[PDB]
Structures are given as C-alpha cells and as structure tokens.
Design a protein around this ligand. Structure first.
Ligand SMILES: Nc1c(-c2nnn[nH]2)cnn1-c1ccc(Cl)cc1Cl
Ligand SMILES: Nc1c(-c2nnn[nH]2)cnn1-c1ccc(Cl)cc1Cl
Ligand SMILES: Nc1c(-c2nnn[nH]2)cnn1-c1ccc(Cl)cc1Cl
Ligand SMILES: Nc1c(-c2nnn[nH]2)cnn1-c1ccc(Cl)cc1Cl
Length: 267
C-alpha cells in the first residue's frame, strides 16, 4: 500500500514536531491514496470557512441573486482579525464578497455573518451531511471554535473527510458547474497559505487552498486541490495538533507533510 511507503517518515516528522499529524491525499488520476492518522479528528480552526463558502454557493443554486445581495453590519459584528470587513463597515459588502473574504483572508466577521445566514454551525453541519460527509461537525462561532481542546470533538473533522468533501465540491457533482468554478476560484485566490501546501508543490502547479490556525495546542492545518501542469488534480488535507496548550504550530511541518504525501502518491 502507498500508506506503507510513507508511514515511517510521517512518524519521524510528527515526533520531531512534538505532536500529531494527520494527512490524507488522493490522486484523482490513478485513484491512489496516502493515509496517516487520516480518520482521527483534528480541530478545523478557520479551515471550516472553505466549506462555509461552498454552502453559500450551494444555496445560490436555489436562491437566485443570493451572491449579489448587499449585507450591512454593525461594528459589533467586527471580531478580532476582520481585516476586510473592517474596511467596509461604513459601506457594507455583498454575500459573494463576504464569502471571498472568509476564504481568502480568513476574515472572522465575514464568516460569522455568513454562518448566521446559513443557520449557524448546525446549518453548515447539515450542508456537509447533505453531500455525504458524516464526520464534519461545527459547533461554535468565531472565535470560540478555535479552543482546540485535547479530546474535544466539537468543531472537528478528519483529514480523510475533509479531502473527500473537498473533492466532491471542487471536482465532483456536489455543486452545479458555475458554482463549482467559483469555489475553485476563491480557493485559488487564498492569501494565507503561501507557507503551507503551496510551499510543497512545484512553481508551475495551480493551487486552491484554505488554512486554519487555532495556534493553541500546536493546532494548524491546510487543505488544497492542486493541478500538475497538464495532469489530473490531487486533493489533500494536512492537520496538526499537540498535547500542551502552549505548544507552537509549525507551517514548515505542514509543508513537509504535504511533500511526503505527494512523494507517497508518486508525484
Ligand atoms: N491595512 C492595509 C492597507 C493599508 N493601507 N493604508 N492603510 N492600510 C493596505 N493593505 N492593507 C491590508 C493589509 C493586510 C490585510 Cl489582511 C488586508 C489589508 Cl486591506
Ligand atoms: N485559540 C484562539 C482563540 C480562542 N478563543 N477561544 N478559544 N480559542 C482565539 N484566537 N485564537 C488563536 C490563538 C493563536 C493563534 Cl496563532 C490563532 C488563533 Cl485563532
Ligand atoms: N490566525 C488567524 C486565522 C487563520 N486562518 N487561517 N490561518 N490562520 C484566522 N484568524 N486568525 C486570527 C484570530 C485571532 C487573532 Cl487576535 C488574530 C488572528 Cl491572525
Ligand atoms: N491540469 C489541468 C488544468 C489546469 N488548469 N490550470 N492549471 N492546470 C485544467 N485541467 N487540467 C487537466 C489536465 C489534464 C487532465 Cl487528464 C485533467 C485535468 Cl483537470
């Protein structure tokens, strides 16, 4: 199995990190998959925002005009790290702009505003159930969902479920064609992941990704769809945690895990 090829280097990497690393990667060309702690739960942190944007896009298939709807919000909506929605407080933003801000800058006010319109964490969880994801659960809002408490299943998923759902939404049939491409375009425009999966791929590959960084408990992550030039894409997810609250996350560890995953698939 391809999992067997990389089991020992993954174990070395997470011992060096001082925590747990979960990876799932699938080659959509061959069907090969690489697994390491891929069914364990890890905190989503801000990475839930990608699926949040997909849920909004799904809703736009039934509700015509949803994306262009202007949304006004008060200053009490501004949560720490709302760098985009901060700048449009006095003006408002459209639903599509909030979605792009949530994905591409991890804007917290934008994410909470969209979560509200979707019916809160249970509403996003329901969307994930509707595409066949039985693992994902969102329970809380920004920023409480980042507590990343050891053993706590709230606001978690697994690397395998994240990868399978990402595949359905970006490459499969879970979204209609125009919405699927919009989701991919938002992921391609992400600004926060240059040191994670993007650092593991060749310079000529196209990448769409979403990051998460709880910070506490050494907890951070990244998931991505990547396209080798002229080849079928790879979908992968890399999640980390660690036992102590003051343990530091590591972007280099995430990039290194992505490299091992790609090497295991034969790329
Ligand atoms: N804050 C600013 C300025 C700016 N220019 N003059 N004063 N401020 C320009 N770019 N940004 C910015 C930086 C980081 C992120 Cl995440 C989002 C934004 Cl909009
Ligand atoms: N862990 C949290 C919380 C939080 N509030 N309640 N429970 N957790 C809020 N911010 N952060 C945080 C800390 C460090 C880094 Cl690097 C990133 C993040 Cl988002
Ligand atoms: N660190 C992050 C992320 C993030 N998303 N993807 N990776 N990290 C999103 N929000 N925050 C954040 C939260 C609280 C404070 Cl006070 C400062 C920050 Cl910057
Ligand atoms: N590699 C790409 C891209 C792409 N766009 N931007 N960068 N790469 C678009 N389509 N494909 C592709 C090529 C061959 C096969 Cl078999 C399957 C696919 Cl999906």
């Amino acid at each position: 199995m391809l999992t067997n090829l990389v089991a020992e280097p993954f174990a070395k990497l997470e011992q060096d990190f001082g925590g747990s690393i979960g990876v799932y990667a699938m080659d959509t060309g061959s069907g090969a998959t690489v697994s390491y702690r891929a069914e364990e739960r890890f905190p989503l942190c801000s990475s839930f925002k990608g699926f949040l944007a997909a849920a909004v896009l799904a809703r736009s298939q039934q509700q015509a005009g949803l994306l262009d709807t202007p949304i006004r919000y008060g200053k009490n909506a501004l949560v720490p790290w709302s760098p985009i929605s901060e700048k449009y407080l006095t003006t408002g933003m459209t639903v599509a702009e909030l979605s792009a801000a949530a994905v591409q800058y991890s804007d917290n006010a934008a994410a909470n505003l969209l979560l509200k319109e979707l019916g809160g964490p249970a509403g996003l969880t329901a969307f994930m159930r509707s595409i066949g994801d039985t693992t994902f659960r969102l329970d809380r809002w920004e920023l409480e969902l980042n507590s990343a408490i050891p053993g706590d299943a709230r606001d978690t998923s697994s690397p395998r479920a994240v990868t399978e759902s990402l595949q359905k939404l970006t490459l499969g049939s879970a979204l209609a064609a125009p919405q699927r491409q919009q989701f991919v375009d938002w992921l391609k425009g992400n600004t926060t992941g240059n040191h994670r999966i993007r650092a593991a791929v060749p310079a000529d590959w196209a990448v769409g990704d979403k990051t998460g960084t709880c910070g506490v408990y050494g907890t951070a992550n990244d998931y991505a769809v990547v396209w080798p030039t002229g080849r079928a894409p790879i979908v992968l997810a890399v999640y980390t945690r660690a036992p102590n609250k003051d343990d530091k996350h590591s972007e280099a560890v995430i990039a290194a895990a992505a490299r091992l995953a790609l090497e295991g698939l034969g790329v």
